[PDB]
Amino acid sequence: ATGAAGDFAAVNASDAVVDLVYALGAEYRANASFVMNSKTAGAVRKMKDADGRFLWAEPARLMGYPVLIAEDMPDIAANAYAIAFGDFGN
Amino acid sequence: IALGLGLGLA
Amino acid sequence: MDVFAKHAVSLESPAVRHYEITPSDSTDLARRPRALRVQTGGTLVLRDETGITVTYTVFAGEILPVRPVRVLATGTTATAVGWE
Amino acid sequence: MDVFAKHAVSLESPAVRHYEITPSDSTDLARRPRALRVQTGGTLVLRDETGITVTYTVFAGEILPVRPVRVLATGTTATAVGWE
Amino acid sequence: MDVFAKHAVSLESPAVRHYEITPSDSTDLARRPRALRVQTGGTLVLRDETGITVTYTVFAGEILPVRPVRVLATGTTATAVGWE
Amino acid sequence: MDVFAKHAVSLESPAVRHYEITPSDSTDLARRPRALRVQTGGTLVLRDETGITVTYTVFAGEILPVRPVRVLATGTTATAVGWE
Amino acid sequence: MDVFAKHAVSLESPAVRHYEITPSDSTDLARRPRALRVQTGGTLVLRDETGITVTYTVFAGEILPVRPVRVLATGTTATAVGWE
């Protein structure tokens, strides 16, 4: 869980992405992928540091891990599961 | 020191 | 509706979360604050994570950008509210 | 003509947009401010996004770098203007 | 000889360029300042780029980190100097 | 033994080097300071690199985050010390 | 439990570690502080790493964002506590 109900966490945003990555298992992260929809990927790319620069660096990968833009996952609601991550091939 | 609004040291 | 919702909250950033502190005296704070807004002027004692403590003769409405682990109750005459 | 037009507006940056706040009391603010410039000294009550509230015995012209969600009208004697 | 010559001048950085402002009243400022150093205490009115204006009961020597587009002359009793 | 030795000294950073300034009047300063700590209250005149100058009615112990090229001696009644 | 534990402590960040300073006079400080919180108002003398020193007529509870190497005891009437 991220923290705050609507958005990501308040004081420390985007570690929800990191502990989700490093709570997935070491062998599954060897070939894993994020799955999101487009208006969640836009909100993740809009996340930025204390200065105004977006903190993340054609498959549009995140943290080196590939990203599958679906159109059928829920958007960022109060209790929605907008971002998934893992080795879907296994 | 400078012109921010930041509760900070300098 | 905040336009700064996507922005990260650094130590230099303004106070998002505030909570009033009690002079707990050998029980540490729940969350250590980025800064202390003083409510009533006086003296208050503050301990670091390294353990050394000094008395601060603080004034009435000052913010002091210190990040204390525990506020003791021996010499604390001043009420403050933490900012984080 | 601003020479800082291309610069991004962070939380630490000066106040671009200001609006006077009313002590709304269980209706949240339109936009939550980065800071509060106080107009008239007194007491005012502030609520976080986590819900906890304290009274601030504020002075006359102080800026306080707090980022409140709602200013209630129960104990608010002080008029302020928000900065964002 | 400045050792900070190669450094970029951000909004958070100190005042490089200063100019005294006049209460122009429906003619905008030449350059909008990062901050306003007040010379004589009083009241002064400030307009954003979005157009909303409030009166600020300002004190004598305060700096206020607001970034105004136009200072009107209706309620302005206070003289200030802009910083940029 | 500074733990911040490897850290770079920005304009926003605290004062590493201080030197008292004299009201030189048409000879520029040796190094232009990031800020001016005032020692004795009064008036002092400050010139930018663009050449425009204003008088500042400054108080006793204020720091003012201005970055002046030359402090003239015509209207300077106030003694200050530069920070850099 | 600090939520800012992973954050790096810059020069601009609040005071993590505090220690009271003595006017040592030709023995340098153990660790040079980012800032000095003054306890009792008065005068105190401060030396840079480049060696030049001035007297500061400081007030009671002011923080001054200077980074001194040694506080001498000749003209020091004011007690302070270092912040780092």
mmCIF file of all heavy atoms in Angstrom, chain E residues 11-48:
data_model
loop_
_atom_site.group_PDB
_atom_site.id
_atom_site.type_symbol
_atom_site.label_atom_id
_atom_site.label_comp_id
_atom_site.label_asym_id
_atom_site.label_seq_id
_atom_site.Cartn_x
_atom_site.Cartn_y
_atom_site.Cartn_z
ATOM 1 N N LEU E 11 15.234 30.947 -8.210
ATOM 2 C CA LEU E 11 14.276 31.734 -7.435
ATOM 3 C C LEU E 11 14.627 31.717 -5.959
ATOM 4 O O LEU E 11 14.309 32.654 -5.220
ATOM 5 C CB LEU E 11 12.859 31.205 -7.642
ATOM 6 C CG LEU E 11 12.030 31.726 -8.812
ATOM 7 C CD1 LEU E 11 12.548 31.223 -10.109
ATOM 8 C CD2 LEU E 11 10.595 31.299 -8.648
ATOM 9 N N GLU E 12 15.278 30.650 -5.515
ATOM 10 C CA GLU E 12 15.612 30.508 -4.109
ATOM 11 C C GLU E 12 16.884 31.278 -3.777
ATOM 12 O O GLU E 12 17.201 31.498 -2.607
ATOM 13 C CB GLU E 12 15.774 29.021 -3.808
ATOM 14 C CG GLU E 12 14.593 28.201 -4.297
ATOM 15 C CD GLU E 12 14.856 26.705 -4.252
ATOM 16 O OE1 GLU E 12 15.964 26.293 -3.851
ATOM 17 O OE2 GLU E 12 13.972 25.938 -4.681
ATOM 18 N N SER E 13 17.635 31.679 -4.801
ATOM 19 C CA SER E 13 18.935 32.304 -4.624
ATOM 20 C C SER E 13 18.777 33.743 -4.129
ATOM 21 O O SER E 13 17.693 34.317 -4.236
ATOM 22 C CB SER E 13 19.681 32.264 -5.954
ATOM 23 O OG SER E 13 19.018 33.071 -6.894
ATOM 24 N N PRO E 14 19.839 34.344 -3.566
ATOM 25 C CA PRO E 14 19.735 35.731 -3.094
ATOM 26 C C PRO E 14 19.519 36.744 -4.209
ATOM 27 O O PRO E 14 19.593 36.429 -5.396
ATOM 28 C CB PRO E 14 21.078 35.966 -2.401
ATOM 29 C CG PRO E 14 21.494 34.657 -1.969
ATOM 30 C CD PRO E 14 21.051 33.707 -3.020
ATOM 31 N N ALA E 15 19.258 37.980 -3.798
ATOM 32 C CA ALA E 15 18.847 39.049 -4.703
ATOM 33 C C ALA E 15 20.047 39.565 -5.476
ATOM 34 O O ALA E 15 20.944 40.190 -4.911
ATOM 35 C CB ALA E 15 18.189 40.173 -3.919
ATOM 36 N N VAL E 16 20.059 39.315 -6.782
ATOM 37 C CA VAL E 16 21.124 39.844 -7.622
ATOM 38 C C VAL E 16 20.839 41.292 -7.994
ATOM 39 O O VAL E 16 21.710 42.161 -7.880
ATOM 40 C CB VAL E 16 21.291 38.969 -8.874
ATOM 41 C CG1 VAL E 16 22.367 39.526 -9.764
ATOM 42 C CG2 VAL E 16 21.611 37.551 -8.482
ATOM 43 N N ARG E 17 19.617 41.574 -8.426
ATOM 44 C CA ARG E 17 19.251 42.857 -8.998
ATOM 45 C C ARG E 17 18.102 43.461 -8.212
ATOM 46 O O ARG E 17 17.096 42.797 -7.956
ATOM 47 C CB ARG E 17 18.846 42.682 -10.452
ATOM 48 C CG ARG E 17 18.575 43.948 -11.199
ATOM 49 C CD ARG E 17 18.328 43.619 -12.652
ATOM 50 N NE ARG E 17 18.132 44.815 -13.459
ATOM 51 C CZ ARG E 17 17.919 44.799 -14.768
ATOM 52 N NH1 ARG E 17 17.865 43.644 -15.412
ATOM 53 N NH2 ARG E 17 17.757 45.935 -15.428
ATOM 54 N N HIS E 18 18.242 44.727 -7.836
ATOM 55 C CA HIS E 18 17.210 45.409 -7.069
ATOM 56 C C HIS E 18 16.828 46.696 -7.774
ATOM 57 O O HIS E 18 17.669 47.332 -8.410
ATOM 58 C CB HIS E 18 17.653 45.708 -5.636
ATOM 59 C CG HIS E 18 18.750 46.716 -5.530
ATOM 60 N ND1 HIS E 18 20.082 46.371 -5.515
ATOM 61 C CD2 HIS E 18 18.713 48.066 -5.453
ATOM 62 C CE1 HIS E 18 20.817 47.463 -5.413
ATOM 63 N NE2 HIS E 18 20.010 48.506 -5.379
ATOM 64 N N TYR E 19 15.568 47.076 -7.649
ATOM 65 C CA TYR E 19 15.028 48.284 -8.248
ATOM 66 C C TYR E 19 13.856 48.741 -7.399
ATOM 67 O O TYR E 19 13.066 47.916 -6.934
ATOM 68 C CB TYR E 19 14.597 48.034 -9.703
ATOM 69 C CG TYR E 19 13.572 46.936 -9.867
ATOM 70 C CD1 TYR E 19 12.215 47.222 -9.914
ATOM 71 C CD2 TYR E 19 13.967 45.615 -10.003
ATOM 72 C CE1 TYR E 19 11.289 46.222 -10.059
ATOM 73 C CE2 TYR E 19 13.048 44.612 -10.147
ATOM 74 C CZ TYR E 19 11.713 44.922 -10.176
ATOM 75 O OH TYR E 19 10.794 43.919 -10.320
ATOM 76 N N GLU E 20 13.756 50.044 -7.168
ATOM 77 C CA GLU E 20 12.635 50.546 -6.390
ATOM 78 C C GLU E 20 11.379 50.568 -7.245
ATOM 79 O O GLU E 20 11.425 50.865 -8.440
ATOM 80 C CB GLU E 20 12.955 51.927 -5.819
ATOM 81 C CG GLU E 20 13.420 52.970 -6.820
ATOM 82 C CD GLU E 20 12.283 53.766 -7.424
ATOM 83 O OE1 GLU E 20 11.175 53.747 -6.848
ATOM 84 O OE2 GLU E 20 12.501 54.418 -8.466
ATOM 85 N N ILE E 21 10.252 50.224 -6.633
ATOM 86 C CA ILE E 21 8.978 50.114 -7.331
ATOM 87 C C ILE E 21 8.124 51.321 -6.986
ATOM 88 O O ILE E 21 8.221 51.866 -5.881
ATOM 89 C CB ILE E 21 8.257 48.795 -6.993
ATOM 90 C CG1 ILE E 21 8.204 48.532 -5.485
ATOM 91 C CG2 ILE E 21 8.922 47.636 -7.688
ATOM 92 C CD1 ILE E 21 6.941 48.978 -4.771
ATOM 93 N N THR E 22 7.306 51.735 -7.925
ATOM 94 C CA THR E 22 6.321 52.767 -7.693
ATOM 95 C C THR E 22 4.925 52.162 -7.742
ATOM 96 O O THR E 22 4.691 51.217 -8.502
ATOM 97 C CB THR E 22 6.431 53.879 -8.740
ATOM 98 O OG1 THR E 22 6.158 53.337 -10.037
ATOM 99 C CG2 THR E 22 7.827 54.464 -8.733
ATOM 100 N N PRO E 23 3.989 52.669 -6.955
ATOM 101 C CA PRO E 23 2.620 52.145 -7.006
ATOM 102 C C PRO E 23 1.916 52.559 -8.287
ATOM 103 O O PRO E 23 1.303 53.625 -8.378
ATOM 104 C CB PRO E 23 1.971 52.745 -5.754
ATOM 105 C CG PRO E 23 2.779 53.947 -5.442
ATOM 106 C CD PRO E 23 4.177 53.612 -5.841
ATOM 107 N N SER E 24 2.069 51.724 -9.313
ATOM 108 C CA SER E 24 1.822 52.159 -10.682
ATOM 109 C C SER E 24 0.333 52.256 -11.014
ATOM 110 O O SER E 24 -0.068 53.163 -11.750
ATOM 111 C CB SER E 24 2.536 51.219 -11.641
ATOM 112 O OG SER E 24 3.940 51.282 -11.460
ATOM 113 N N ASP E 25 -0.474 51.307 -10.525
ATOM 114 C CA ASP E 25 -1.960 51.407 -10.602
ATOM 115 C C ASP E 25 -2.446 51.335 -12.060
ATOM 116 O O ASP E 25 -2.742 52.394 -12.645
ATOM 117 C CB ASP E 25 -2.477 52.643 -9.862
ATOM 118 C CG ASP E 25 -3.899 52.480 -9.355
ATOM 119 O OD1 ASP E 25 -4.625 51.633 -9.912
ATOM 120 O OD2 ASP E 25 -4.266 53.194 -8.401
ATOM 121 N N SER E 26 -2.570 50.105 -12.569
ATOM 122 C CA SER E 26 -3.138 49.672 -13.858
ATOM 123 C C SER E 26 -2.138 49.820 -14.995
ATOM 124 O O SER E 26 -2.510 49.753 -16.171
ATOM 125 C CB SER E 26 -4.450 50.381 -14.223
ATOM 126 O OG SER E 26 -4.227 51.739 -14.552
ATOM 127 N N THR E 27 -0.873 50.031 -14.656
ATOM 128 C CA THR E 27 0.239 49.763 -15.559
ATOM 129 C C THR E 27 1.148 48.760 -14.866
ATOM 130 O O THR E 27 1.567 48.990 -13.732
ATOM 131 C CB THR E 27 0.994 51.045 -15.907
ATOM 132 O OG1 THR E 27 1.491 51.644 -14.708
ATOM 133 C CG2 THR E 27 0.080 52.032 -16.613
ATOM 134 N N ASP E 28 1.426 47.640 -15.530
ATOM 135 C CA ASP E 28 2.168 46.560 -14.893
ATOM 136 C C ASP E 28 3.628 46.940 -14.685
ATOM 137 O O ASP E 28 4.128 47.897 -15.278
ATOM 138 C CB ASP E 28 2.081 45.287 -15.727
ATOM 139 C CG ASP E 28 0.713 44.655 -15.673
ATOM 140 O OD1 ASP E 28 0.031 44.824 -14.645
ATOM 141 O OD2 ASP E 28 0.321 43.987 -16.652
ATOM 142 N N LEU E 29 4.303 46.186 -13.819
ATOM 143 C CA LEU E 29 5.707 46.437 -13.536
ATOM 144 C C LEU E 29 6.573 46.088 -14.737
ATOM 145 O O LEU E 29 6.165 45.322 -15.614
ATOM 146 C CB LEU E 29 6.157 45.629 -12.324
ATOM 147 C CG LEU E 29 5.526 46.030 -11.000
ATOM 148 C CD1 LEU E 29 5.977 45.088 -9.911
ATOM 149 C CD2 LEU E 29 5.884 47.458 -10.663
ATOM 150 N N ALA E 30 7.766 46.678 -14.780
ATOM 151 C CA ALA E 30 8.715 46.406 -15.849
ATOM 152 C C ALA E 30 9.196 44.966 -15.794
ATOM 153 O O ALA E 30 9.121 44.225 -16.779
ATOM 154 C CB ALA E 30 9.897 47.371 -15.752
ATOM 155 N N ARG E 31 9.696 44.563 -14.635
ATOM 156 C CA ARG E 31 10.078 43.190 -14.360
ATOM 157 C C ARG E 31 9.443 42.795 -13.040
ATOM 158 O O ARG E 31 9.484 43.571 -12.085
ATOM 159 C CB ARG E 31 11.597 43.056 -14.297
ATOM 160 C CG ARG E 31 12.285 43.192 -15.645
ATOM 161 C CD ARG E 31 13.788 43.138 -15.502
ATOM 162 N NE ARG E 31 14.273 44.372 -14.901
ATOM 163 C CZ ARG E 31 14.791 44.464 -13.683
ATOM 164 N NH1 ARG E 31 14.913 43.382 -12.934
ATOM 165 N NH2 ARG E 31 15.190 45.642 -13.224
ATOM 166 N N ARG E 32 8.831 41.625 -12.988
ATOM 167 C CA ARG E 32 8.198 41.228 -11.740
ATOM 168 C C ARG E 32 9.261 40.691 -10.790
ATOM 169 O O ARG E 32 10.158 39.957 -11.219
ATOM 170 C CB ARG E 32 7.074 40.217 -11.973
ATOM 171 C CG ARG E 32 7.480 38.919 -12.578
ATOM 172 C CD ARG E 32 6.320 37.984 -12.825
ATOM 173 N NE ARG E 32 5.726 37.509 -11.589
ATOM 174 C CZ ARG E 32 4.646 36.743 -11.539
ATOM 175 N NH1 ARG E 32 4.067 36.345 -12.658
ATOM 176 N NH2 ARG E 32 4.160 36.352 -10.373
ATOM 177 N N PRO E 33 9.244 41.082 -9.524
ATOM 178 C CA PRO E 33 10.354 40.744 -8.637
ATOM 179 C C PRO E 33 10.159 39.389 -7.992
ATOM 180 O O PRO E 33 9.036 38.904 -7.862
ATOM 181 C CB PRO E 33 10.310 41.860 -7.596
ATOM 182 C CG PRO E 33 8.885 42.213 -7.534
ATOM 183 C CD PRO E 33 8.336 42.060 -8.911
ATOM 184 N N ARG E 34 11.267 38.776 -7.580
ATOM 185 C CA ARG E 34 11.161 37.555 -6.790
ATOM 186 C C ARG E 34 10.675 37.854 -5.386
ATOM 187 O O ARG E 34 9.954 37.050 -4.787
ATOM 188 C CB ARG E 34 12.499 36.836 -6.719
ATOM 189 C CG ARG E 34 12.938 36.207 -7.987
ATOM 190 C CD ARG E 34 14.180 35.428 -7.714
ATOM 191 N NE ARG E 34 15.301 36.296 -7.415
ATOM 192 C CZ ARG E 34 16.450 35.862 -6.925
ATOM 193 N NH1 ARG E 34 16.609 34.576 -6.662
ATOM 194 N NH2 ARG E 34 17.430 36.711 -6.689
ATOM 195 N N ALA E 35 11.078 38.989 -4.830
ATOM 196 C CA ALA E 35 10.694 39.327 -3.475
ATOM 197 C C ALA E 35 10.616 40.834 -3.350
ATOM 198 O O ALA E 35 11.118 41.575 -4.195
ATOM 199 C CB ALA E 35 11.677 38.760 -2.454
ATOM 200 N N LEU E 36 9.978 41.280 -2.279
ATOM 201 C CA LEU E 36 9.802 42.695 -2.010
ATOM 202 C C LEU E 36 10.395 43.022 -0.652
ATOM 203 O O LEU E 36 9.931 42.507 0.367
ATOM 204 C CB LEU E 36 8.327 43.073 -2.034
ATOM 205 C CG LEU E 36 7.621 42.961 -3.375
ATOM 206 C CD1 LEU E 36 6.155 43.224 -3.184
ATOM 207 C CD2 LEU E 36 8.207 43.961 -4.327
ATOM 208 N N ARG E 37 11.407 43.871 -0.638
ATOM 209 C CA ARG E 37 11.903 44.450 0.597
ATOM 210 C C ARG E 37 11.119 45.722 0.854
ATOM 211 O O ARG E 37 11.090 46.618 0.007
ATOM 212 C CB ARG E 37 13.402 44.736 0.530
ATOM 213 C CG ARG E 37 13.930 45.519 1.722
ATOM 214 C CD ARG E 37 13.710 44.765 3.011
ATOM 215 N NE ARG E 37 14.172 45.498 4.178
ATOM 216 C CZ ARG E 37 15.373 45.354 4.716
ATOM 217 N NH1 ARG E 37 16.230 44.493 4.194
ATOM 218 N NH2 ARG E 37 15.712 46.063 5.781
ATOM 219 N N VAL E 38 10.458 45.783 2.004
ATOM 220 C CA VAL E 38 9.665 46.950 2.342
ATOM 221 C C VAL E 38 10.561 47.997 2.989
ATOM 222 O O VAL E 38 11.404 47.680 3.835
ATOM 223 C CB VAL E 38 8.506 46.537 3.263
ATOM 224 C CG1 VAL E 38 7.637 47.722 3.611
ATOM 225 C CG2 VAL E 38 7.695 45.465 2.595
ATOM 226 N N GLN E 39 10.401 49.248 2.573
ATOM 227 C CA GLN E 39 11.154 50.351 3.149
ATOM 228 C C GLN E 39 10.429 51.012 4.307
ATOM 229 O O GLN E 39 11.006 51.171 5.386
ATOM 230 C CB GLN E 39 11.448 51.401 2.080
ATOM 231 C CG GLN E 39 12.307 50.890 0.959
ATOM 232 C CD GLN E 39 13.660 50.459 1.446
ATOM 233 O OE1 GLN E 39 13.949 49.270 1.524
ATOM 234 N NE2 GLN E 39 14.505 51.424 1.773
ATOM 235 N N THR E 40 9.175 51.401 4.106
ATOM 236 C CA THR E 40 8.377 52.069 5.120
ATOM 237 C C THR E 40 7.140 51.226 5.372
ATOM 238 O O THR E 40 6.489 50.790 4.421
ATOM 239 C CB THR E 40 7.988 53.477 4.666
ATOM 240 O OG1 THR E 40 9.170 54.213 4.334
ATOM 241 C CG2 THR E 40 7.251 54.216 5.771
ATOM 242 N N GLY E 41 6.831 50.986 6.644
ATOM 243 C CA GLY E 41 5.720 50.111 6.973
ATOM 244 C C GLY E 41 4.382 50.739 6.624
ATOM 245 O O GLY E 41 4.251 51.960 6.533
ATOM 246 N N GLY E 42 3.387 49.888 6.402
ATOM 247 C CA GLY E 42 2.053 50.370 6.081
ATOM 248 C C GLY E 42 1.235 49.288 5.417
ATOM 249 O O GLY E 42 1.380 48.102 5.723
ATOM 250 N N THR E 43 0.376 49.712 4.498
ATOM 251 C CA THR E 43 -0.412 48.797 3.688
ATOM 252 C C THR E 43 -0.003 48.963 2.239
ATOM 253 O O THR E 43 0.342 50.069 1.814
ATOM 254 C CB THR E 43 -1.909 49.052 3.830
ATOM 255 O OG1 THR E 43 -2.211 50.368 3.353
ATOM 256 C CG2 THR E 43 -2.336 48.937 5.275
ATOM 257 N N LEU E 44 -0.034 47.868 1.484
ATOM 258 C CA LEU E 44 0.212 47.902 0.052
ATOM 259 C C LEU E 44 -0.593 46.794 -0.609
ATOM 260 O O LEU E 44 -0.823 45.743 -0.001
ATOM 261 C CB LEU E 44 1.703 47.762 -0.269
ATOM 262 C CG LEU E 44 2.432 46.421 -0.272
ATOM 263 C CD1 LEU E 44 3.780 46.579 -0.943
ATOM 264 C CD2 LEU E 44 2.611 45.862 1.102
ATOM 265 N N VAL E 45 -1.042 47.041 -1.833
ATOM 266 C CA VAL E 45 -1.917 46.128 -2.554
ATOM 267 C C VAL E 45 -1.140 45.502 -3.704
ATOM 268 O O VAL E 45 -0.343 46.171 -4.374
ATOM 269 C CB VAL E 45 -3.187 46.842 -3.038
ATOM 270 C CG1 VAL E 45 -4.028 47.211 -1.862
ATOM 271 C CG2 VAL E 45 -2.837 48.106 -3.751
ATOM 272 N N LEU E 46 -1.339 44.207 -3.907
ATOM 273 C CA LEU E 46 -0.566 43.403 -4.839
ATOM 274 C C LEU E 46 -1.488 42.561 -5.699
ATOM 275 O O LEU E 46 -2.431 41.959 -5.191
ATOM 276 C CB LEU E 46 0.385 42.490 -4.090
ATOM 277 C CG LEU E 46 1.835 42.865 -3.848
ATOM 278 C CD1 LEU E 46 2.006 44.160 -3.165
ATOM 279 C CD2 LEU E 46 2.328 41.818 -2.925
ATOM 280 N N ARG E 47 -1.189 42.486 -6.989
ATOM 281 C CA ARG E 47 -1.993 41.727 -7.932
ATOM 282 C C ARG E 47 -1.157 40.606 -8.532
ATOM 283 O O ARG E 47 -0.002 40.822 -8.907
ATOM 284 C CB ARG E 47 -2.529 42.633 -9.036
ATOM 285 C CG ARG E 47 -3.524 41.960 -9.946
ATOM 286 C CD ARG E 47 -4.002 42.901 -11.026
ATOM 287 N NE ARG E 47 -4.725 44.039 -10.477
ATOM 288 C CZ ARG E 47 -6.019 44.027 -10.179
ATOM 289 N NH1 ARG E 47 -6.738 42.932 -10.378
ATOM 290 N NH2 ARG E 47 -6.595 45.111 -9.683
ATOM 291 N N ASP E 48 -1.745 39.418 -8.629
ATOM 292 C CA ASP E 48 -1.110 38.281 -9.276
ATOM 293 C C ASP E 48 -1.172 38.408 -10.791
ATOM 294 O O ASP E 48 -1.614 39.415 -11.349
ATOM 295 C CB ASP E 48 -1.788 36.980 -8.874
ATOM 296 C CG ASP E 48 -1.488 36.591 -7.469
ATOM 297 O OD1 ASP E 48 -0.382 36.915 -7.002
ATOM 298 O OD2 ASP E 48 -2.356 35.972 -6.824
#
